[PDB]
Amino acid sequence: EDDENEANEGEEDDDKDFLWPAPNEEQVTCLKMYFGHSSFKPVQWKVIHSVLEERRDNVAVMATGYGKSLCFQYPPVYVGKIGLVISPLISLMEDQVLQLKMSNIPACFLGSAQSENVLTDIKLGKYRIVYVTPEYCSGNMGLLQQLEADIGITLIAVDEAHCISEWGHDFRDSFRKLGSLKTALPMVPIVALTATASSSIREDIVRCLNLRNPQITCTGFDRPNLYLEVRRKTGNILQDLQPFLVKTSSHWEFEGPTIIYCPSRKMTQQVTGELRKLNLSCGTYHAGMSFSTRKDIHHRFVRDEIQCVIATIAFGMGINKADIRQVIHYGAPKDMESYYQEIGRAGRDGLQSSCHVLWAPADINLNRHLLTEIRNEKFRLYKLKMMAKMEKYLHSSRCRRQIILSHFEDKQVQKASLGIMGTEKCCDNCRS
Numbered sequence: 026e027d028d029e030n031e032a033n034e035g036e037e038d039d040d041k042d043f044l045w046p047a048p049n050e051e052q053v054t055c056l057k058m059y060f061g062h063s064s065f066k067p068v069q070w071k072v073i074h075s076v077l078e079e080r081r082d083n084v085a086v087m088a089t090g091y092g093k094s095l096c097f098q099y100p101p102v103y104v105g106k107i108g109l110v111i112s113p114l115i116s117l118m119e120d121q122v123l124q125l126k127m128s129n130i131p132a133c134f135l136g137s138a139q140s141e142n143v144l145t146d147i148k149l150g151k152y153r154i155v156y157v158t159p160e161y162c163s164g165n166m167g168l169l170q171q172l173e174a175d176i177g178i179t180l181i182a183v184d185e186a187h188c189i190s191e192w193g194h195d196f197r198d199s200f201r202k203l204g205s206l207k208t209a210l211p212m213v214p215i216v217a218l219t220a221t222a223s224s225s226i227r228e229d230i231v232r233c234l235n236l237r238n239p240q241i242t243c244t245g246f247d248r249p250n251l252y253l254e255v256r257r258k259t260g261n262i263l264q265d266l267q268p269f270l271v272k273t274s275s276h277w278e279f280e281g282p283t284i285i286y287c288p289s290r291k292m293t294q295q296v297t298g299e300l301r302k303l304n305l306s307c308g309t310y311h312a313g314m315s316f317s318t319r320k321d322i323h324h325r326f327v328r329d330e331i332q333c334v335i336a337t338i339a340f341g342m343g344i345n346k347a348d349i350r351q352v353i354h355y356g357a358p359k360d361m362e363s364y365y366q367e368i369g370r371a372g373r374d375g376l377q378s379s380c381h382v383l384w385a386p387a388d389i390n391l392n393r394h395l396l397t398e399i400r401n402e403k404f405r406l407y408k409l410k411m412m413a414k415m416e417k418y419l420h421s422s423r424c425r426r427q428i429i430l431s432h433f434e435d436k437q438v439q440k441a442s443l444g445i446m447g448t449e450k451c452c453d454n455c456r457s
């Protein structure tokens with residue numbers, strides 16, 4: 026019988042079309058053969074590609090185990106070398122080793138009692154994936170150095186990585202000496218995994234594991250407190266933003282802390298100018314500004330001395346602010362990936378927030394003419410596909426939450442979202 030009906034008339038859209046660079050044919054064959062999947066989710070590819078091609082440290086926040094294991098199991102299987110998984114979760118490690126064996130991936134649990142059986146075979150390069158406790162790993166840095174020299178370690182995964190922080194709710198003394206991994210193995214990337222989206226605990230993990238410029242990702246969350254809306258521009262900045270404003274004592278303000286993302290530096294200045302006329306507490310943020318001025322706006326926003334930052338998408342990576350009540354995209358966003366990163370900064374305190382896109386078909390990020398100028402065929406086609414996916418989202422009458430979760434998240438996240446989805450607080454299209 027037919028197992029899916031994903032194909033639609035008027036589209037040749039695979040999940041691979043929205044990955045940069047594209048997975049090659051052997052990478053797809055490997056994924057199918059050893060993991061029984063046809064495609065990578067964007068976050069899975071971000072982690073896998075950063076490990077394989079850049080040897081980059083990662084902190085991967087993953088709310089659940091749905092789609093998690095692929096990020097650290099796939100790279101060593103693809104290159105045919107060795108990946109180490111450090112975890113205190115014995116039963117889960119046993120379950121994953123058996124699943125790998127049943128997929129014809131040579132994997133084992135290494136510990137003191139298991140060493141007589143597996144250690145010689147690990148040293149000779151017969152295992153793709155080795156699971157160890159932090160206690161065992163801490164007394165065997167010599168072994169890891171030999172495996173790096175003789176085989177080459179694709180990555181070290183540290184699961185329950187929040188256990189390294191004495192400031193968290195689940196501290197393990199066993200994790201303390203994992204700080205030595207980067208000293209013993211400076212060229213081996215670490216993928217630190219945790220379920221906690223706490224910026225405080227992320228900083229502790231990066232410090233304690235000595236991670237260098239780690240790629241930070243955060244997935245598996247439904248974010249029921251984010252309301253999504255897409256609305257047409259009206260041809261006038263004050264006309265467009267007036268609906269978001271309330272008059273208080275001869276000055277106007279937003280409901281709460283607000284970020285307005287604009288495509289151009291020019292537009293950030295234009296929008297700031299119109300809000301300044303209303304004596305609204307706001308500041309401009311773009312790369313054309315000085316280091317001190319940018320640093321000042323950051324601190325002032327964090328201290329609630331300004332209510333609104335009008336910014337390019339240069340603003341956001343350095344802000345851990347939990348009470349962002351409103352994100353406005355003033356102009357179509359660059360693509361769905363950037364849009365996802367930007368709306369994800371809203372309502373991290375878990376209270377009701379709104380994310381509005383104000384767009385016109387004439388917006389710079391819907392202009393195909395700028396993309397036709399791209400002479401690299403592969404990059405041109407990717408940029409056109411990303412613009413088309415963004416345009417399809419903006420134009421849609423379907424649930425905005427369903428579109429975003431379908432693209433970025435494991436299907437399990439959609440099952441958790443069925444409560445918020447279709448209600449008055451989900452999105453503009455669910456309210457109608």
Ligand SMILES: C[C@H]1CC2(CCN(C(=O)c3ncccc3O)CC2)c2c1n(CC(=O)Nc1ccc(C(F)(F)F)cc1Cl)c1nc(N3CCOCC3)nn1c2=O
Pocket residue numbers: 222241242243244246247248249251253341342343344345365366367368369370372373374375425426429430
């Ligand atoms: C988007 C990612 C990336 C980011 C962290 C990385 N980042 C940086 O700037 C950054 N980079 C480097 C260093 C430090 C940094 O801050 C951008 C923001 C982040 C994400 N998420 C996930 C998410 O929101 N998914 C999500 C789910 C549903 C919906 C929808 F459709 F229903 F509306 C939309 C989206 Cl986008 C996330 N989720 C929670 N929460 C989960 C629930 O508890 C509260 C925190 N926080 N959070 C995040 O911070």
Ligand SMILES: [Zn+2]
Pocket residue numbers: 423424425426427446447448451452453454455
């Ligand atoms: Zn909806």
